């Protein structure tokens, strides 16, 4: 046996990753040695890159969605660092708001107690966010991500709360913060106003009723008919107490039925078929002639003005809209257009209050009843004025944290105005809506489709309600001047409060008196001021991160505008939008240059992950099972810009991708492990096959890099895998196995192959470093030849090398053209397959080939096809137009197993020299 006499060609780099054991040691090392602060400190940094982290809410353990987010940021940041740039990536945490406070509220009820005290209540919220900020930081680090995680930004930091307030101050001083009174989203479960980003639309069952409002005697007499009752359709009988008007479409025909029901003519066929009204039409009237008629509410006998709405629809309902200014936005403006009462007797908990008694809007038995529980009895009380009751299902707004359905209540709140012109920094005049639309156009969106998703929301969004009635957050810390009943926006007062917030935090706004919150110039008039006690929308907190992080640290944590932000698709409704609006107020532009949007983590069915249905695949279990580098590769190897379905069969296919990458690196390290390192200093004479591989390596390297530049990691990884699978393993390593294992260690041709393998292993390490960082760190740990070839202590010294300069290749060396011999190789391998089907021969080495086109260099044909002989022989095997196969007229060599030995069981001529070399 000659197996002892072959080159060993082994490496300590193991085949099995054993990731759940080795990865924790790597990530713990990067924290001990401060790898990120070392990345920033790299002395040859050239250029700058800023990724501004969007702060996840400081609540709960991380799920797979958080991991997808951070891993994608980690790939983008590591890509820029390995391109040679100074990077800025300070992660942050969203600590205020209902995402944290609602958990305190739910914990207190399960604990059977409560908490009136403001300071102590904010403390338990603050401690909850601190506890889960630290839990999430360590779970992020167990994914291999690198950022300033030991110095993250926190909205609960005193300096940060002061930065948020100073951002609000800028909004106020530009004339965009104004009080408004109108119906808005109201969550009775937390007794607070809401805006769109705090609202979740989902399907809900609801009553759907058609109600008859009889015309009063004088209106019947003015219309000259015996009976007439306008029919309204509504899904909210809880608002009927607050009716003041019935709205019709302007200049539209309304049909009067023989039973005396008045509806829009365009809808009579639907309503008659529904059995709401009868089928016979006696008269038709124009809605213009019906305006200012008066009807009688059948619920409380109150008057109802027949009015004309701006856009009454004739596709649904009846063409007659029950109008309640207290509980509808378009209802409110119509009530003001006709100067009607704003009836609103629903308190902050969604229950009828004493206003129904004083204004006789509803029977006293409804006092204290919740509006949704009272609807069954209201419908019964409608009597025979109820023409038809159905139950339907419609999309309905719910509170994002209490998950209860919201209502609308006419209330006075604070708003950022969208269509109010304000003075631009360049001296011009524009509305916030116009500025945001122009700022969107300067932002690159990845994918491009996310642009008009944000553009559409900006085109249609209303004024932004900022004021909330909760405790955990940054207060709208302004004083109302009782003398003028306006807010005080004088700079000395606002900066005095801001300085106090910066040193002490926002707790002082609840604790201190009015005079102690006022500057010295103002205490003599302390009696004339009252504190606003609303807190800011938590989406204003996160929308201000660019100012608190990028601007207030003067580029020490990144430049404003940032180069890249990267969040999930639900952030067009949220952080993307709130940051755009706040950035457009302060700087008149978006605080980001590029938006990368990724999809959501969904189950095997494509359904949303819920902590209830159990479709949640826990991140911890996923990491223990597959390892972080496989989860990272699963992210990069999949269509992250769309939703990602989680199934263990998809991670198995990813492990096969990781095994293939890892097995390839093990072969490379094993087959240049014995190369004398003074080979690195001298130029080599590379073969045609060597140059084909070096030129192919250069071609796919440009493709992988160009794809990774566009963040299309699937495309680049496919180019990498196909190269690894076809050109590298299938062709090159197959043809070099004889020289690597059977030629002398001193053979210049074997040494040249090892340089090619060394170059290939360098390129794979560079391109895989941002994705499989622990694995590439492991590779460099096990190869002294790789560490000296790349001049790298570890993975963080990786640079994109020039293969030409480090291998001393000639300029204007004409590229190889293997289009002919590779097609002959394909044709031979097909014919070789069928000869093995018959069982004639077992290997390519048993064959001799005579090619009919002598243009093909003989020894390259022998190398690529791994025939033992090129030319004529005795025993024909089969023939094609291109070649003839013969049985190799030699014995199999006992050492290299090639058919090149002239005598049985005797080493071939090459192996004899090697076996006796001194
Ligand atoms: C200021 C913002 C960031 C706000 N604090 C917030 O929403 O913070 P939040 O903690 O809710 O999320 C923070 C980030 O995680 C992503 N995200 C959440 N659920 C996901 C899911 N099922 N699949 C994939 N990504 C998911 C989400 O888009 C965001 O980029
Ligand atoms: Zn041999």
Tab-separated table of N, CA, C and O and ligand atoms in Angstrom, residues 53-59 62-70 73 93-95 99 136 153 400-401 538-539 541-543 545 566-571 574-576 578-579 598-602 608-609 643, ligand 1:
chain	number	residue	atom	x	y	z
A	53	UNK	N	-29.667	53.002	13.403
A	53	UNK	CA	-30.539	51.955	13.909
A	53	UNK	C	-31.902	52.524	14.284
A	53	UNK	O	-31.998	53.566	14.940
A	54	UNK	N	-32.959	51.844	13.849
A	54	UNK	CA	-34.289	52.120	14.334
A	54	UNK	C	-34.509	51.382	15.635
A	54	UNK	O	-34.259	50.177	15.733
A	55	UNK	N	-34.971	52.084	16.663
A	55	UNK	CA	-34.983	51.506	18.007
A	55	UNK	C	-36.153	50.557	18.193
A	55	UNK	O	-37.320	50.974	18.128
A	56	UNK	N	-35.887	49.272	18.417
A	56	UNK	CA	-36.972	48.363	18.797
A	56	UNK	C	-37.473	48.693	20.192
A	56	UNK	O	-36.743	49.227	21.030
A	57	UNK	N	-38.743	48.378	20.431
A	57	UNK	CA	-39.343	48.687	21.721
A	57	UNK	C	-38.707	47.842	22.818
A	57	UNK	O	-38.565	46.624	22.677
A	58	UNK	N	-38.312	48.500	23.908
A	58	UNK	CA	-37.667	47.833	25.031
A	58	UNK	C	-38.679	46.992	25.802
A	58	UNK	O	-39.059	47.327	26.930
A	59	UNK	N	-39.119	45.895	25.192
A	59	UNK	CA	-40.144	45.046	25.782
A	59	UNK	C	-40.081	43.681	25.120
A	59	UNK	O	-40.162	43.582	23.892
A	62	UNK	N	-36.376	38.767	22.087
A	62	UNK	CA	-36.320	38.878	20.638
A	62	UNK	C	-36.993	37.681	19.984
A	62	UNK	O	-36.823	36.538	20.416
A	63	UNK	N	-37.764	37.949	18.941
A	63	UNK	CA	-38.283	36.904	18.074
A	63	UNK	C	-37.523	36.942	16.751
A	63	UNK	O	-36.662	37.800	16.529
A	64	UNK	N	-37.841	35.990	15.869
A	64	UNK	CA	-37.082	35.839	14.630
A	64	UNK	C	-37.126	37.100	13.774
A	64	UNK	O	-36.213	37.339	12.974
A	65	UNK	N	-38.171	37.916	13.925
A	65	UNK	CA	-38.238	39.158	13.174
A	65	UNK	C	-37.152	40.139	13.571
A	65	UNK	O	-36.543	40.787	12.715
A	66	UNK	N	-36.895	40.263	14.876
A	66	UNK	CA	-35.800	41.109	15.340
A	66	UNK	C	-34.459	40.608	14.813
A	66	UNK	O	-33.583	41.407	14.460
A	67	UNK	N	-34.285	39.284	14.749
A	67	UNK	CA	-33.023	38.720	14.280
A	67	UNK	C	-32.815	38.997	12.796
A	67	UNK	O	-31.719	39.384	12.376
A	68	UNK	N	-33.859	38.793	11.989
A	68	UNK	CA	-33.799	39.142	10.572
A	68	UNK	C	-33.375	40.592	10.382
A	68	UNK	O	-32.559	40.908	9.508
A	69	UNK	N	-33.929	41.490	11.200
A	69	UNK	CA	-33.610	42.909	11.087
A	69	UNK	C	-32.138	43.171	11.379
A	69	UNK	O	-31.437	43.806	10.582
A	70	UNK	N	-31.648	42.683	12.521
A	70	UNK	CA	-30.286	43.004	12.934
A	70	UNK	C	-29.252	42.327	12.041
A	70	UNK	O	-28.188	42.899	11.774
A	73	UNK	N	-28.853	44.378	8.880
A	73	UNK	CA	-28.018	45.529	9.206
A	73	UNK	C	-26.562	45.120	9.379
A	73	UNK	O	-25.651	45.848	8.968
A	93	UNK	N	-32.848	51.762	21.626
A	93	UNK	CA	-34.040	51.115	22.151
A	93	UNK	C	-35.133	52.143	22.387
A	93	UNK	O	-34.892	53.192	22.993
A	94	UNK	N	-36.328	51.833	21.897
A	94	UNK	CA	-37.515	52.641	22.130
A	94	UNK	C	-38.093	52.244	23.485
A	94	UNK	O	-38.674	51.164	23.627
A	95	UNK	N	-37.936	53.117	24.484
A	95	UNK	CA	-38.250	52.759	25.861
A	95	UNK	C	-39.577	53.305	26.374
A	95	UNK	O	-40.106	52.761	27.347
A	99	UNK	N	-46.275	50.301	24.331
A	99	UNK	CA	-45.613	48.984	24.281
A	99	UNK	C	-44.963	48.567	25.588
A	99	UNK	O	-44.850	47.364	25.856
A	136	UNK	N	-32.414	42.119	25.431
A	136	UNK	CA	-32.359	42.188	23.976
A	136	UNK	C	-30.948	42.469	23.472
A	136	UNK	O	-30.578	41.995	22.393
A	153	UNK	N	-28.051	53.998	22.285
A	153	UNK	CA	-28.894	55.141	22.600
A	153	UNK	C	-30.226	54.673	23.174
A	153	UNK	O	-30.741	53.608	22.826
A	400	UNK	N	-53.318	49.326	19.159
A	400	UNK	CA	-52.216	48.426	18.833
A	400	UNK	C	-51.713	47.630	20.032
A	400	UNK	O	-51.064	46.597	19.837
A	401	UNK	N	-51.996	48.067	21.255
A	401	UNK	CA	-51.488	47.378	22.437
A	401	UNK	C	-52.579	46.791	23.318
A	401	UNK	O	-52.415	45.681	23.832
A	538	UNK	N	-45.341	58.280	21.086
A	538	UNK	CA	-44.068	57.571	21.096
A	538	UNK	C	-43.476	57.493	19.696
A	538	UNK	O	-42.264	57.306	19.544
A	539	UNK	N	-44.303	57.642	18.661
A	539	UNK	CA	-43.773	57.737	17.309
A	539	UNK	C	-43.092	59.074	17.056
A	539	UNK	O	-42.309	59.187	16.108
A	541	UNK	N	-41.157	60.252	19.536
A	541	UNK	CA	-39.889	59.868	20.147
A	541	UNK	C	-38.946	59.269	19.112
A	541	UNK	O	-37.832	59.761	18.899
A	542	UNK	N	-39.395	58.203	18.444
A	542	UNK	CA	-38.551	57.504	17.480
A	542	UNK	C	-38.314	58.332	16.224
A	542	UNK	O	-37.256	58.209	15.595
A	543	UNK	N	-39.283	59.155	15.830
A	543	UNK	CA	-39.057	60.071	14.728
A	543	UNK	C	-38.005	61.124	15.000
A	543	UNK	O	-37.541	61.769	14.054
A	545	UNK	N	-35.055	60.411	16.573
A	545	UNK	CA	-33.775	59.765	16.853
A	545	UNK	C	-32.652	60.375	16.027
A	545	UNK	O	-31.519	60.498	16.505
A	566	UNK	N	-32.791	50.614	7.758
A	566	UNK	CA	-33.212	49.280	7.331
A	566	UNK	C	-34.195	48.730	8.355
A	566	UNK	O	-33.785	48.328	9.447
A	567	UNK	N	-35.481	48.701	8.008
A	567	UNK	CA	-36.506	48.209	8.920
A	567	UNK	C	-37.548	47.416	8.138
A	567	UNK	O	-37.490	47.307	6.910
A	568	UNK	N	-38.520	46.869	8.873
A	568	UNK	CA	-39.584	46.103	8.263
A	568	UNK	C	-40.613	46.971	7.562
A	568	UNK	O	-40.683	48.186	7.748
A	569	UNK	N	-41.444	46.312	6.751
A	569	UNK	CA	-42.397	47.030	5.911
A	569	UNK	C	-43.455	47.773	6.716
A	569	UNK	O	-44.089	48.688	6.181
A	570	UNK	N	-43.659	47.415	7.984
A	570	UNK	CA	-44.622	48.134	8.808
A	570	UNK	C	-44.115	49.497	9.259
A	570	UNK	O	-44.831	50.193	9.988
A	571	UNK	N	-42.909	49.894	8.856
A	571	UNK	CA	-42.344	51.168	9.271
A	571	UNK	C	-42.642	52.303	8.302
A	571	UNK	O	-42.380	53.462	8.641
A	574	UNK	N	-44.899	53.734	10.210
A	574	UNK	CA	-44.319	54.186	11.458
A	574	UNK	C	-43.042	55.001	11.368
A	574	UNK	O	-43.078	56.193	11.049
A	575	UNK	N	-41.903	54.364	11.657
A	575	UNK	CA	-40.673	55.110	11.913
A	575	UNK	C	-40.184	55.850	10.672
A	575	UNK	O	-39.665	56.968	10.783
A	576	UNK	N	-40.327	55.249	9.487
A	576	UNK	CA	-39.969	55.962	8.261
A	576	UNK	C	-40.765	57.256	8.131
A	576	UNK	O	-40.215	58.304	7.772
A	578	UNK	N	-42.640	59.034	10.544
A	578	UNK	CA	-42.447	60.010	11.610
A	578	UNK	C	-41.071	60.658	11.540
A	578	UNK	O	-40.926	61.839	11.876
A	579	UNK	N	-40.052	59.908	11.114
A	579	UNK	CA	-38.732	60.504	10.932
A	579	UNK	C	-38.720	61.452	9.741
A	579	UNK	O	-38.078	62.507	9.787
A	598	UNK	N	-37.374	45.294	4.494
A	598	UNK	CA	-37.478	43.843	4.475
A	598	UNK	C	-38.885	43.414	4.871
A	598	UNK	O	-39.607	44.132	5.567
A	599	UNK	N	-39.268	42.225	4.415
A	599	UNK	CA	-40.571	41.674	4.713
A	599	UNK	C	-40.693	41.222	6.156
A	599	UNK	O	-39.833	41.476	7.003
A	600	UNK	N	-41.793	40.529	6.432
A	600	UNK	CA	-42.071	40.013	7.762
A	600	UNK	C	-41.837	38.509	7.822
A	600	UNK	O	-41.950	37.799	6.819
A	601	UNK	N	-41.509	38.033	9.016
A	601	UNK	CA	-41.384	36.603	9.269
A	601	UNK	C	-42.784	36.017	9.398
A	601	UNK	O	-43.573	36.448	10.246
A	602	UNK	N	-43.101	35.042	8.548
A	602	UNK	CA	-44.391	34.370	8.567
A	602	UNK	C	-44.155	32.868	8.667
A	602	UNK	O	-43.034	32.379	8.525
A	608	UNK	N	-49.217	35.424	9.669
A	608	UNK	CA	-48.492	36.192	10.672
A	608	UNK	C	-48.155	35.324	11.871
A	608	UNK	O	-48.944	34.465	12.267
A	609	UNK	N	-46.964	35.542	12.437
A	609	UNK	CA	-46.538	34.815	13.629
A	609	UNK	C	-47.227	35.424	14.839
A	609	UNK	O	-47.239	36.649	14.999
A	643	UNK	N	-41.910	38.805	2.294
A	643	UNK	CA	-42.135	38.022	3.502
A	643	UNK	C	-41.451	36.664	3.392
A	643	UNK	O	-41.345	36.078	2.312
B	1	LIG	C1	-39.272	52.827	15.822
B	1	LIG	C2	-39.859	51.395	15.513
B	1	LIG	C3	-38.655	50.385	15.066
B	1	LIG	C4	-40.619	50.872	16.682
B	1	LIG	N1	-39.855	51.071	17.899
B	1	LIG	C5	-40.933	49.389	16.511
B	1	LIG	O1	-41.723	49.071	15.792
B	1	LIG	O2	-40.221	48.425	17.293
B	1	LIG	P1	-40.526	46.790	17.077
B	1	LIG	O3	-39.972	46.053	18.247
B	1	LIG	O4	-42.026	46.534	16.971
B	1	LIG	O5	-39.810	46.268	15.733
B	1	LIG	C6	-38.525	46.826	15.386
B	1	LIG	C7	-38.077	46.229	14.007
B	1	LIG	O6	-38.478	44.597	13.922
B	1	LIG	C8	-39.193	44.468	12.853
B	1	LIG	N2	-40.197	43.413	13.012
B	1	LIG	C9	-41.126	43.340	13.929
B	1	LIG	N3	-41.841	42.231	13.741
B	1	LIG	C10	-41.343	41.602	12.685
B	1	LIG	C11	-41.652	40.398	11.991
B	1	LIG	N4	-42.764	39.533	12.429
B	1	LIG	N5	-40.931	40.051	10.940
B	1	LIG	C12	-39.928	40.810	10.529
B	1	LIG	N6	-39.608	41.945	11.152
B	1	LIG	C13	-40.294	42.356	12.218
B	1	LIG	C14	-39.865	45.882	12.654
B	1	LIG	O7	-40.234	46.064	11.400
B	1	LIG	C15	-38.673	46.824	13.028
B	1	LIG	O8	-37.731	46.933	11.871
